[PDB]
Amino acid sequence: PNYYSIEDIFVTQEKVECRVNTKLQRMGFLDSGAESDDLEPGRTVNLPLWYIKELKVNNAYFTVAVPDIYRNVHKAVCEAETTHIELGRLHPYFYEFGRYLTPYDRNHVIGRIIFETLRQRVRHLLDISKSDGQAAKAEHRLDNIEAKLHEAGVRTNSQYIEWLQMT
Amino acid sequence: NQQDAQINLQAVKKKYKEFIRTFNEENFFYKYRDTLKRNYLNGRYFLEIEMEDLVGFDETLADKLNKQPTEHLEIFEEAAREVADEITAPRPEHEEHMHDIQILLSSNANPTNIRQLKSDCVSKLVKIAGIIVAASGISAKATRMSIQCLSCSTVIPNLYALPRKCNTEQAGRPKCPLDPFFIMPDKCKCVDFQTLKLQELPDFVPQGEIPRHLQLFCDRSLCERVVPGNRVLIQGIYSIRKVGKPSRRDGREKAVVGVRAPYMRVVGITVDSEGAGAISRYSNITSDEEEHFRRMAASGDIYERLSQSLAPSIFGSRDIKKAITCMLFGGSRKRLPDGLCRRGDINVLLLGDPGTAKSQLLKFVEKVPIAVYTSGKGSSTASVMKDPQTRNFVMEGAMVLADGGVVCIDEFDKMREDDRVAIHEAMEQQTISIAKAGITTTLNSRCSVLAAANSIFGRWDDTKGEENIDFMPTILSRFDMIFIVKDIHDESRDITLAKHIINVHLSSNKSAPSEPAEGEISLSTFKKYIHYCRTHCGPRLSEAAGEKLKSRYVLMRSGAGQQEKASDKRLSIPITVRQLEAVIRISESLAKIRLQPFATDEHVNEALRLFQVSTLDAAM
Amino acid sequence: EGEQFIKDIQREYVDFLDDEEDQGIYAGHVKDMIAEKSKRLIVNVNDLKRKNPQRALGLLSNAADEQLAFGRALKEYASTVDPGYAKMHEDLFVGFEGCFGNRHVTPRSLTSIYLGNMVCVEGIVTKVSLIRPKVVRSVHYCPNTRKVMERKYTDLTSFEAVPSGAAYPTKDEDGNLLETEYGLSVYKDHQTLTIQEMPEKAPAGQLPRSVDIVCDDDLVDRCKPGDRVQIVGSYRCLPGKRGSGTFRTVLLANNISLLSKESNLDISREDIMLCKKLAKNNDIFELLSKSLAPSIGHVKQAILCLLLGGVEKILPNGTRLRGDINVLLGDPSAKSQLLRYVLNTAPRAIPTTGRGSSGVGLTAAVTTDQETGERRLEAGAMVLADRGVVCIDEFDKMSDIDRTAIHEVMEQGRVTISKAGIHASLNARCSVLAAANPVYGRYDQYKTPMENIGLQDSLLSRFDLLFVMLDVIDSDVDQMISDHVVRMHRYRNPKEADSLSFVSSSEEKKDTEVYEKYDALLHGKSRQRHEKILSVEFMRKYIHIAKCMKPKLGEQACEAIANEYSRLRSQEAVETDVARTQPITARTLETLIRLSTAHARARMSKSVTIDDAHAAIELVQFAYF
Amino acid sequence: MDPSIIEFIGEKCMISIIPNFSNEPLHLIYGPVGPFRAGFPVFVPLWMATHLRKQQKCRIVPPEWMDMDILEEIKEEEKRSKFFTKMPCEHYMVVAQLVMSTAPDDVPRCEELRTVIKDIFDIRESKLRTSIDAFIKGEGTYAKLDNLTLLEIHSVRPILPYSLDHIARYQRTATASQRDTSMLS
Amino acid sequence: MFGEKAFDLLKELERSSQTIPAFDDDGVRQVLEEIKAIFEENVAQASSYNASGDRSLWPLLNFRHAALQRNKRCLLAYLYERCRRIKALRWEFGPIIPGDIKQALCEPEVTFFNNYSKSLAAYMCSAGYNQGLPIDLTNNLRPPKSLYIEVRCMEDYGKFELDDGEVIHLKKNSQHYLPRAQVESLVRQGILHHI
Amino acid sequence: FTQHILNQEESREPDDKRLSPEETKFAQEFASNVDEYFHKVATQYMPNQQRGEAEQRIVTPNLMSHVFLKANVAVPAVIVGVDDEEVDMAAGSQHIIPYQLVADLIQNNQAQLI
């Protein structure tokens, strides 16, 4: 049951820094037992996505909640640096997070940033048009959605070569 | 432009220009257009070429190319940019601006020797093979620029005279003579310049002499190309920088007639393939290679095959050798957010009766990516010199040349202690410190070391008790696996050693029937294999390994203390944190070999039995 | 006034000053209506791109006079706005600053490109150097005619052009008077220095390279050599290059980031409030004990007070004394790794070698044709650690030449030193550590307490305590230490009923799976703490005020110090410790004073208690007890 | 998208050639085939001259766009063809390869010819990179084919679109969905 | 590992590319000990007054849900790609030459192997002819050429050539009385890139 | 697409137009196989609600895989069945679009694919 993928469940997992407005109870997978069916209004928490995927963006059991990469400052200067914002692997996938997370902001900015980032791939792979040589070239500034088309375009050229004569 | 021969135009006119458009085989690969364009795409701005294509094309250029290459190899550049800028046009709209490029040359003709690089061999293309020592930093150079006085990009043939007239003459009759040149480096250019270096070979007239060497030059893309201590194949050119014979005799009492200086510039360095001559930093290796690698890693009969790689003429010492190579791979530099960068590399001891092939073995461990060997009386205080140009205090600082490599030495015993202490220390923290003159540059580098030695009194000390070292137990501390060498008698052993080496020592014997053994082959492969396997995997333990290893070290210290008590006096080696802190690196070396990240305690029972040699050695 | 796009560009910057952005914020109350008068304004390019990208990246490709025009248009703007500051008739260059990320190369990688660009550097403060003034223009005068002409001069390091070469005028018209008026003839400030890669990205198969820097007036010498730095400036290359002989580089047009302070922190009087809220908690000293060394038993309760420098005590035109603390003790295997808890944890932390000549504290000042006439100068390796502490390894392996050269300013707590060229003196009132070894390893207790070390017994009074460090285990504690050491080995590596995987979520993630390598909190929260109350930053954020507060003496100190020193000199030289009762003297008082002075700063109690008495004696007896 | 799948498309095209037989051990196929007489041209597909010339059965001649002057003027028109140019048979990049394998046993000037086809191929391709260099705001209702040929376009096909869906989903959702003041996904 | 093992589960096929020795039924036993390890808890609170209907469970429903999601659909892949590879090599041959082993059948793959073979068989019957000519599609691409001779090969194993021969020894030098219908199965599953 | 392909077919069960019957036998045979394979997984506790061919289990719903269209009609903008702005239609041209919006012209065969 998903927008399916071999990456079918890199989907509902990204952990957060979620705060608290009100009380909580019985944290379960945290250090919790028969110890706290009560906690404070105001505590930062790391949390998965699955149970909170369906927990009431309007309601406040939990609160305004972002990760810090996902905080707007670098993301803002990267809609001004939507030209060479460099990635690596500290945030390997950076492309469809908002493709869930956008409405939980309460500030209405996320998607514009992201779309601009990938309009840059509408400009980027101008340079990517060939497989020139041996094994590997540039294989760590990559989300694993660009990995797919990257390999794919490589293959396209790879077999275009065998076309190029009897080869 | 005197269109008779040697003309500026004929070459560029069509010949070089069309050589590549014309360079053809079906399969429609066989040009240099594809390589050029696909190089351009990724900012390369070069391409690779042969020198025996002209025979594929013609019979004239080459015997003209050797003569005045300095010009031909820039006509090449111009033809290159004009033949490539047409393709820079997808339509006329995406050459935002052109760009400059560098050509390469290569061949397989033959390497020469420095002893012959002579006045005939000058301004002339060549091939050699030497070795590298060190070379400069990365300064600067450019090609042209403008001047406000004339406002023209000053165009030059040579890579200075600046004549008289003003060119701000439109001042009336009040002109500005006597060279008023204001260089406008808003309008200048910039290429690279690095001054590579070259030592001669180890077999080609160093015999009753010493080896000379040579200094070099580069322009654009051969910086960041060569790290020193490497074996090169080269195409360069032998030319000068200054000029003059007549009685303008140089200096104060210099130059009887005309002596000007040597050097070479590179037109197309390449590298060596002494098996894997040049496999140290870059990767021209291909998917077949890596399949080979991992499928041998997939092979579960690789380590015992590798126990037989250094001894194809040597007998015995197999329990001794189950970790003589595990030293090479290194474990893990498992650093942490606090200081505790727990020790990465690995160190070994060995000492015992001579006649047991320590020297040749360490020569081979040098042979098999990066390493050095001296031994005693003297690689590396570290070196604070004072620059004879300008008299500044630079730091050559030579364990720096093991910044990932390893070291081997004997002759720790046979050199005094004024020089042991900086190296006593480096190999616990890997940070070469400095505090001497006006600098506090705590340098660092990841080297290991191998330690051979010689005990005075031999096996006498080894029969009875405590005369093991002559110097100290604080370097009995730093090493994990420590090995006696005896030559205890047995006639079977005697005869077998007898014929074993004679069958070696007869007629340069084993060419054909040597490699027919199983898989014990190609130290070249090991250069490549090592420089791979260390460069990827960063393993660390599995849970089930930790408790048994912990309890084992517990019982180790308890047995050492009991031998202390079973003799009523200290009978032990110090049960250190270093011993576990190193056996961890033995596990790490094993997992580095098979490439499985998470290592189990059966993987390391082998480690247990190998350092057990050290335990039962210092058991008495 | 070159090609006339320059003036278009001027007004394109004037077009910055329209509305809320700059007509509201950036123009007016910005340097001069606030009156600190830093002619170097604060620009960030991003707003300029948000107006004129032709002026954003037309700048970061060419900066011939776009800067000149920027400063011109700005001064004309404020000339409209505010003639009061119209008396600074100069360029008034600007920032063009930012923590942007266009291109931020190393000193290694200013590589044959970037010429004619405005870009970044990072690296080390090094060779913080000497100052001079510079020539602008000369207000001459003729009493003969009562005529004050003027003449400005340039050179490439300031802008492009060069003066139409000549010296200052004399009889320039025909023979009338040329009285050079100074004071009206003006001068900036000048400076010159270099940077190295904070190097640890360097490949030590290779050489960490160097750069070339120039600065100017309101930028003059803004940190010390021995610190970490990031900077952003423009680039130029003047010299001859075979038209005559090759080429060189230089950098300028910049503002700074020093990236290691606390005043860098956006500091209200609230951080003090957090400290003082938690300050009352009494047994926090033990938390700070387990704080800095969380990766190792063992001490640091005491080492803190070294880490706090000390306390100043001067008398009415009488003397002064040095306030700071110094100790050290041990066979190999946590001694040699308890020194890099400072090099990379706390500031002003400069380790030394154990092998050092002519600049452990010397300079030797050797000089060869400096740009100016400096006949003799260099600096040293101590003022780097002024007002703090120092590390060394291999001390017993140090020369016994300069050991006494330590004793000089160590015991004096003064500099009256020179290399025979000029008498020099200052106040560097420093502490230090080093490392140690018994000459034969496993010996300090069986044979003797002393003489397993083998050196002057003079220093032991210069330092504070004879102390102990050993390594053995009996039959029972071995598995206890085993479980301790195995906590060391596991509370560091990550990730530690029939089927328990395949949980609702997995390791499959987008962007928070493994940062570097994760760690545990299980049962170190049975230790009821937090990673922020027990941390680096809130720790260091409680550095400054304990260094600003000054806990004066009580009154009950005196009878107690009396009774305890009495018994100390009575019977500390008995019961198996006599040869470790050699250095007793009338010096335990001042160290006890530094002790309670420090400990009364760890909660900032400007006061004294008997509990502090126990705290400052019990370690001393625990040395052996 | 392949090297041969398009020859199921491209190689079925026809020229007219000369055989050295008349009607064979069989006369003729019930089909569009012409009557077989040696010494005279006959119209055939080009999946057979392949089979025939190497079967040592025939000669062959090309079309007329396989020349010099057409392939010297098409290029210079194509230079400022801001969109596209003259299209001689529209898949001549596959015919020419299956031509120039064997037939250059006797074809004329089979080298400068190749030079030009490469010279036109590369440029038209490269143009077909820079079309991308204006595509803003999700213009998936505006494109170019007008004198395109197919052997160039399949070299792109799988790359962009299997991305372009979720790429411009942020804006293709715009004319297909609704939200409050901000842009929707 | 918390729902990741399928990276390990299809690592059964790590060497089995086209240099395949054989195959097995990995990665089911302890992992489907889960499915019954957990339903207990997932339905522990079932229609209970243990909370009398409030917000508290609302993850736990989802805990179950995602656990199952991962489980079932991992499994979907675990058979699906197996169908895929076997189908590929079965496009290189009919069920004349069956699987390398027929021992890596995770039991319900009885249903699956047979189902796929015979769904395709049905579709075959429709295809080829209306009655159905299982029509040669991917092997024996001789144009009209010889009928009865043997040839040279490249060292096959599996030994599955039953067709019409006493023993043709389907390997290199499978060289015996080989008719045409004898040699009717294998073209590129590893033999005759070279006669 | 054994998931909701059945659903359009139970919308009409078209004639030889949409799908063909042997495909239907094939497909329901397969979906039975998947369920009776899941048999030997968790079928003491097969899904307690979402038991047979399920509600969120979908494979091929997506109809916006943006494909290339071939012109063949009036070289002016013969404006015809598609949701988008197919303004500027032609005869030998293309202005590329999604696919959902035209499952019309190719059932008319007014236009073609490439």
Ligand SMILES: Nc1ncnc2c1ncn2[C@@H]1O[C@H](COP(=O)(O)OP(=O)(O)OP(=O)(O)O)[C@@H](O)[C@H]1O
């Ligand atoms: N067991 C052996 N098998 C084969 N060759 C041997 C063996 N032992 C020694 N040799 C040969 O004898 C020579 C030994 O010289 P080497 O320099 O090793 O002395 P050594 O063992 O290092 O003694 P020392 O350590 O005192 O120098 C080598 O050339 C080696 O090839």
Ligand SMILES: Nc1ncnc2c1ncn2[C@@H]1O[C@H](COP(=O)(O)OP(=O)(O)OP(=O)(O)O)[C@@H](O)[C@H]1O
């Ligand atoms: N309790 C501990 N705390 C910190 N480190 C420890 C501890 N126990 C063991 N170690 C580690 O064990 C190793 C022992 O080496 P150590 O640094 O003590 O040598 P050393 O103190 O420099 O020797 P020497 O004092 O003779 O120079 C170190 O790497 C250290 O990190």
Ligand SMILES: Nc1ncnc2c1ncn2[C@@H]1O[C@H](COP(=O)(O)OP(=O)(O)O)[C@@H](O)[C@H]1O
């Ligand atoms: N009679 C004394 N008068 C003053 N101070 C003394 C006396 N005896 C000991 N002290 C202490 O000794 C210190 C100075 O001693 P100092 O001369 O350094 O001893 P040493 O000669 O061992 O170096 C003073 O700080 C003071 O605390």
